[PDB]
Amino acid sequence: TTCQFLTKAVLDNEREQLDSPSARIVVGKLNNVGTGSFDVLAKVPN
Amino acid sequence: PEDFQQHEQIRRKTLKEKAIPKDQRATTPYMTKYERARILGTRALQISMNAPVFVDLEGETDPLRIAMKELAEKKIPLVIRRYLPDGSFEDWSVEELIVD
Amino acid sequence: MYKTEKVDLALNRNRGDPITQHFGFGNDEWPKEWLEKLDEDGLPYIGTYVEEGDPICAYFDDTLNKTKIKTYHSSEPAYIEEVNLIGDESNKFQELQTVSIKYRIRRTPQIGDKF
Amino acid sequence: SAAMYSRFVKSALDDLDKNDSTQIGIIANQVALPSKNPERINDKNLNILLDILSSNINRIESSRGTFLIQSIINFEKWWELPPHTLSKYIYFIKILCSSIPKWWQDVSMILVSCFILPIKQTVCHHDMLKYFLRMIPSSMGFIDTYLAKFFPNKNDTRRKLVNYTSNLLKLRGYCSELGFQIWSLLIEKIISIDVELQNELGIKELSTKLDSILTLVSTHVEEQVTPESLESGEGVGVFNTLTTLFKTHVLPTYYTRSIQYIMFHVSQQQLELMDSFLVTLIDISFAVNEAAEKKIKSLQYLGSYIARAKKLSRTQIIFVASYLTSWLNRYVIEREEEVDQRGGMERFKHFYAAFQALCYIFCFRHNIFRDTDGNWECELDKFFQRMVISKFNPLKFCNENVMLMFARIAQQESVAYCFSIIENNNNERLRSSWSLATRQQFIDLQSYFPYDPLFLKNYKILMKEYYIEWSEA
Amino acid sequence: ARFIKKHKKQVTNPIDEKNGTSNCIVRVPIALYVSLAPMYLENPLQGVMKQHLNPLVMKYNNKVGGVVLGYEGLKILDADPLSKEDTSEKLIKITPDTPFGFTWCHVNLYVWQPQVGDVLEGYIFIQSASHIGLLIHDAFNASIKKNNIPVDWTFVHGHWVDSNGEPIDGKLRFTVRNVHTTGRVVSVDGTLI
Amino acid sequence: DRLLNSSDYTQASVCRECGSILTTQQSVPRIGSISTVCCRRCSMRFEDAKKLIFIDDSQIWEDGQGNKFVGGNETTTVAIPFVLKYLDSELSAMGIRLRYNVEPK
Amino acid sequence: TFIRGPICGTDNCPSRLWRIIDGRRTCQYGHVM
Amino acid sequence: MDISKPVGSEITSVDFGILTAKEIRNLSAKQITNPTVLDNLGHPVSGGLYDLALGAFLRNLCSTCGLDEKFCPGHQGHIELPVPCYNPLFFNQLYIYLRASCLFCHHFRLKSVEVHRYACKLRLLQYGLIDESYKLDEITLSSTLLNELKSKRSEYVDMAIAKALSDGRTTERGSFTATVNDERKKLVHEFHKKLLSRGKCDNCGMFSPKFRKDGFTKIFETALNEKQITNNRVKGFIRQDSTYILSTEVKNILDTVFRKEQCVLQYVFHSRPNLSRKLVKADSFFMDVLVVPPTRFRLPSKLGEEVHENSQNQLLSKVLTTSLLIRDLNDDLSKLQKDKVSLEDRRVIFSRLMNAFVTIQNDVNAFIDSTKAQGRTSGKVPIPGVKQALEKKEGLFRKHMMGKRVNYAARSVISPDPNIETNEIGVPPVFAVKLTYPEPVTAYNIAELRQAVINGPDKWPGATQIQNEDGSLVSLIGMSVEQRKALANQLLTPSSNVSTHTLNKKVYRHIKNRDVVLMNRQPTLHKASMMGHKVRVLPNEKTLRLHYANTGAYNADFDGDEMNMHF
Amino acid sequence: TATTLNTPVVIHATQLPQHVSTDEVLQFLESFIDEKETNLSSSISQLKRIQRDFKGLP
Ligand SMILES: [Zn+2]
Ligand SMILES: [Zn+2]
Ligand SMILES: [Zn+2]
Ligand SMILES: [Zn+2]
Secondary structure: OHHHHHHHHHHOOOEEOOOOHHHHHHHOOOOOOHHHOEEEEEOOOO | OHHHHHHHHHHHHHHHHHHOOHHHOOOOOEOOHHHHHHHHHHHHHHHOOOOOOOOOOOOOOOHHHHHHHHHHOOOOOEEEEEEOOOOOEEEEEHHHOEOO | OEEEEEEEOOOOOOOOOOOOEEEOOOOOOOOOHHHHOEOOOOOEOOOOEEOOOOEEEEEEEOOOOEEEEEEOOOOOOEEEEEEEEEOOOOOOOOOOOEEEEEEEOOOOOOOOOOO | OHHHHHHHHHHHHHHHHOOOOHHHHHHHHHHHOOOOOOOOOOHHHHHHHHHHHHHOHHHOOOOOOHHHHHHHHOOOOHHHOOHHHHHHHHHHHHHHHHHOHHHHHHHHHHHHHHHHOOHHHOHHHHHHHHHHHHHOHHHHHHHHHHHHHOOOOOOOOHHHHHHHHHHHHHHHOOOHHHHHHHHHHHHHHHHHHHHHHOOOOOOHHHHHHHHHHHHHHHHHHHHHOOHHHHHOOOHHHHHHHHHHHHHHHHHHHOOOOOOOHHHHHHHOOOHHHHHHHHHHHHHHHHOOOOOHHHHHHHHHHHHHHHHHEOOOOHHHHHHHHHHHHHHHHHHHHHHHHHOOOOOOHHHHHHHHHHHHHHHHHHHHHHHHOEOOOOOEHHHHHHHHHHHHOOOOOHHHHOOHHHHHHHHHHHHHOOOOOOHHHHHHHHHHHHOOOOOOOOHHHHHHHOOOOOOOOOOOHHHHHHHHHHEOOOOOO | OOOOOOOOOOOOOOEOOOOOOEOOEEEEEEEEEEEEOHHHOOOHHHHHHHHHHHHHOOOEEOOOOEEEEEEEEEEEOOOOOOOOOOOOOOOOEEOOOOOOEEEEEEEEEEEEOOOOOOEEEEEEEEEOOOEEEEEEOOOEEEEEEOOOOOOOOEEEOOEEEOOOOOEOOOEEEEEEEEEEOOOOOOEEEEEOO | OHHHHHOOEEEEEEEOOOOOOOOEEEOOOOOOOOOOEEEOOOOEEHHHHHOOOOOOHHHEEEOOOOOEEEOOOOEEEEEEEHHHHHHHHHHHHOOEEEEEEEEOO | OOOOOOOOOOOOOOOOOEEOOOOOEEOOOOEEO | OOOOOOOOOEEEEEEEEEOOHHHHHHHOOOEOOOOOOEOOOOOEOOOOOOOHHHOOOOOOOOOOOOOOOOOOOOOOEEEEEEEEEEOOOOHHHHHHHHHHEOOOOOOEOOOHHHHHHHHHHHHHHHOOOHHHHHHHHHOOOOHHHHHHHHHHHHHHHHHHHHHHHHOOOOOOOOOOOHHHHHHHHHHHHHHHHHHHOOOOOOOOOOOOOEEEEOOOOOEEEEOOOHHHHHHHHHOOOOOOOOOEOOHHHHHHHHHHHHHHOHHHHHHHOOOOOOOOOOOOOHHHHEEEEEEEOOHHHOOOEEEOOEEEOOHHHHHHHHHHHHHHHHHHHHHHHHOOOOOOOOOOHHHHHHHHHHHHHHHHHHHHHOOOOHHHOOOOOOOOOOOOOHHHHHHOOOOHHHHHOOOOOOOOOEEEEEEEOOOOOOOEEEEOHHHHOOOOOEEEOOOOOHHHHHHHHHHOOOOOOOEEEEEOOOOOEEEOOOOOHHHHHHHHOOOOOOOOOHHHOOOOOEEEEOOOOOOEEEEEOOOOOOHHHEEEEEEEEOOOOOOEEEOHHHHHHHOOOOOOOEEEEEO | OOOOOOOOOEEEEOOOOEEOOHHHHHHHHHHHHHHOOOHHHHHHHHHHHHHHHOOOOO
16 A cells, blocks of 8 residues: 555655665665675785 | 764774674585575676686686686685675685585 | 458548548659559559558648658568458548558468467 | 947947846857858958957956857858958957966867868968967867867768868877877777778778878878987887887787788888887787787788888898797797697697798798808708698698698798698598687688788879889799 | 855965965875776776876866875775785675776875965966966966956056056966866966955 | 666666755756756755855856756766656655665765 | 658768667668667 | 666665655746646647756757756656645644644643653654663652653653663664564554543643544534533633634644644654754645656657647646636735725635635645545546556556566467477577677677677677677668678777776677576466576577476466567 | 766765975975876876976976
């Protein structure tokens, strides 16, 4: 019930921390599941 | 301005305290099936854009296959940063993880 | 398979209005490849092979001072079967405004056809 | 009139200090008109407007003044104004961009775009570019991009193209620092020259285009590069940047017919220029880091060059032979043992590549390798045979037409006898293996000779002094 | 109650001795977040230099509020917060979508920051009835508009003449009215009153 | 890729300062100058800013109509699904404001 | 394949736009934008 | 999405809030005032809904940025509402606080001490301190005692938050989990119940007249009852030291109550600590302006050949007319003295004003909302307002996020094949020639891609275009073999431009056997109905060929069912 | 123009700028010019002019 939950969010001055799968799809953020559950770094010499 | 610097140093310090001592690591010493796939894909991506390559191509034209080869010889200069659910993390080098 | 399409360039005109568009060719300069599909009247020769983008109709538009062209839209090519001139009643005087074109589509039975 | 107009403007400026802005705008609009419209402000009145504005430019440096200024920068065909009036326009622009550097951006853009015009008609444009490049060195940035932006397209008229390069060369000669970027632009046109000519080898068009362009470039370079200019000059600068662009553009793309003759030709101006090119080619063709295809292309260049370049000295040639046999003798001594081992004959692309080049060099210049005695420099008689009978079996893997011609000539000179090895080779063929997925690119690479004869009318004539046709050898 | 007013020219540039001009050359430490292309994965410092720093040289930069002359002591901040500032092996996080890295860096910038009010000296290179054109440190453009020159100064055909009837030449001392920075190159607006 | 790439992937401007993706626009520059990306919410009408130190040149921008503005230069680009812009737009019709926190600051 | 319109988005034409259904739009020398 | 256009900035959180009329006015590109949308020549009417400041429209260029219909992002403008309106989203909450108010002392009618006890609890819950909020209730040792009670509860909350911050348990940003959110929601409910449960004001002892509503957002005020007017004047000495009621009266009442009861409201309206320090204002429940969304979100539609107006514009222009009409009522209203001037016109002016407010309020309701609009001409069925567009049919989430129309990819009837591998898919050349990966060109693949470009769009395995380093595309479609051979020889030329130096060209090739696609048969009820298969291109085929071993997964029958191939 | 390839995503001064003596400006110009030996070329050219002025010349 989109507008109801929205009304509730506004009146709470809520922050969407963007952790749920739904929220991340909304904002275009890579999902928190899966191959996304860790970071990759490169070992560089010199 | 002086104190944003301080703020950043605190953020980055606590992040590392999540991201943790090497000798206090506690997760699996095996590379996960997920870590493997992403390591391959990402290293393949870097190969496709002229990353220095650490192995003999021997005629290979598929950058994924080149990555696989690099993985096999443990010459992939990537590090996996594993996040525990509180946001603290362990850094594991691709070479040190047991691959299978 | 047979498909019948109705081309009716009285579709815009506001009821018994002056007629802007008449089947045929104007005297301005237009492709000429057009005559491969279309007879002098601006209707297509019967039997013609027609694939997507080809002309199936030519008329002269007065408000444009140009000769325009209704094109064939199916991605499946076909042949012209019947072209009917649907004249109007209310006693003659009126020139050609409505035509029906019947396309013939070959179906050698294909993969995915049901028996 | 004369003094009435002096009033009209003097009023307009007063009226501008009051912000009415109408009078000015009336004037601006009058100057903005096209070169064609009779109603555009005439010379005499323009003389006046200009000399008044120049005398106190600060009166105009306002938002209200912008439109007027824009209208004078955008004055059509100003370079076409009568002497005296032209002079007042120039002095005005000079004055304007000095008290307000901001407008130099707008003025120079229009200037560069005029580079499509003939040399005789640009003096004023260059005079102005020279002036403000000096006083506003920071401008070199955006004005360089203009050099890019306004280059005529390949389709555009030849006179446009030929002009816009004539000017760029002129520009080069007073703004050196842009020099490299310039040469990079011309060369990168480079690619269009590569386009012109190979495929064809309308087409009649690209010929005379590409022909008009190169003949220009090379004559400007013949002048830019000279011994006097090499010790104390920017001759060095030009050679360098042309050699760099050769390594980055010509060699790789590496199927160009237009274009590698710039290096063929500048090279042979002076003995050291040749020396630098040879050693440069040698470098590229035997460097350990470079990709094999690069090494093979260089080796083709190397062999073609030695064969063709008329101004080469006997000893520079023997130099290249002495390098190749030396490098070859080592290869066979250190590596023949690897043939009956696991792998294919492709492992030795590079060997054949070099042996080709050397054979090719022998075709064109065998008459030179006999010293006074009648003996062979580099023991070519004894040397060729050794390679021909080696396990690499060069004769089978190198270009077929060269190997054939080498056979013919070598046999004639009592230098080597290959013809039975050839027989054996295409017999074994009918009845030492290499994939053919990758075996073809090699056959392709060994067929291309970057200094096989030119087919551009003029350039050819110009090259004659620097070229050995097969008939000559 | 609200401060966007923290974009107010706080140069302060000191007056000199044995001299009279303002020293505007300054050394500022910065942090900068930059991309590293995959081709530079074996030469990260080289890459940061060729991609980001080199293009800043001798151009005005909105953030340091002056022209950047050059740079010293580039350092990459290791994404591994546990390593010693010493080691020459560092981590750079790779974009999810692309092969590019992004890291923070520290470097030192040398900046010519003439603020309004400062006293500079220029070499005169042009004189019309509309402005005097100068070159500061033989490098940066200056310009004194016709009515920033004192009223009793006169002009001829040309070249300017001062309060006492003698022509001006070469070195001239002026104060900064405004610094125009958005054009192709920096330009200083100077006054003599 | 599907949401990502097929879906409506769009590089869009945000104001880092107010966190909006709806109040940015390209500046309209004088000829010769280059256009920049600015926030209509975070910037003052030029007049009002004078009416309250000297104002730097890089801090002024203009629109097509001709009004001059001071400030609003804290913009970047972020990758968002286009439909987000539509949702944000509809929400602001209803008087509702989304504020995106962007990093790095 | 013609429509004349929209010159060409390449400043070494402007040469002359036809749109293909795939939306490349193609100018004769062979820019596809 | 292009791997060679990386993005550095990243969105990390989103904050919900309310647009103030000050913000809107400042950001607005144009104030819209004309109901009329086009003129006789089909150009945008200035100051109308297609005004070019709101963005490029049709041929025309945007007057704000100067961009064309393609690169212009659109810009918002605003309408000036001549009289405040309730924001239909929030009218219920407004109703609660209005009813709870004391129109005399301007506190809530609930005793201050209780209200403070709620403020304490909610504040503790901002920091996730659930145990502490119960301990707060454990505090007890007439108006002198109460202020000491209030005070000691207050010093407990401070001490608890301080202690919680010093050890691990919270940050200044708060702590917010489900169990916390549950406790919070209960309290706010309990608080609201207690607000409305009071008759006489616990603080000054007076009775306020009761407020009643509509389903169409109108507020009535019922005058005082007999016992209650008696009770009120008895308290008359201590204070010494039905009807429609306008939205402006309501706003004034709440404005004052929100000042007085600000403390509690500061926590009722913030689930997290309010670092921003903004006051909670009554205005938040009202609109003095409407944001007109950019023109690109309000375009007309073409139903075949006929063109239809945008429905959101139809609604906005009704706001516009009413707006002009009220600005006229307001003009004649001021041209009273009536210092002279005979009273009754007072009644008629009010009549006209009530009329205006009601119908604008209806048009707003209808949009948020057609529900809040009076059913039109009994029939027709309502026209959807914005609320119904966002919520209508299956909704944005289900219709354009869960599910989407997709671009590259193919569909075909499937046919069985025992001769391909169980992990392959037999691809017809008709597909193989049209589907390209964008392949980046490198040393390792320059041979291959050269050949593809030479082969062209129509000979498989070929290519349909080339992407240059400056992002531009070049079509291989109209081309001869020589032109293609030329482009194929410049695939790997160096960079003549520092800015693009890190990029290489891309060839939009046809796909081949090295490749992987995603096969799909609907309904997709588990993940094995969408798997990756290795490509095997098969000459002369017109359908997709699939090994039997896969029927199980896909639930495929070969009875003319179709599959999707995604590349 | 400016992309993520040639332009920092963000720049911040970490301290207040420190003024430098002429002797320092000269020592810095010296080394910076040496270390860096088309846009960069025309720039060190300009730096070369500035270091000339700081030594007093034309
Ligand atoms: Zn903003
Ligand atoms: Zn073009
Ligand atoms: Zn716009
Ligand atoms: Zn009360």
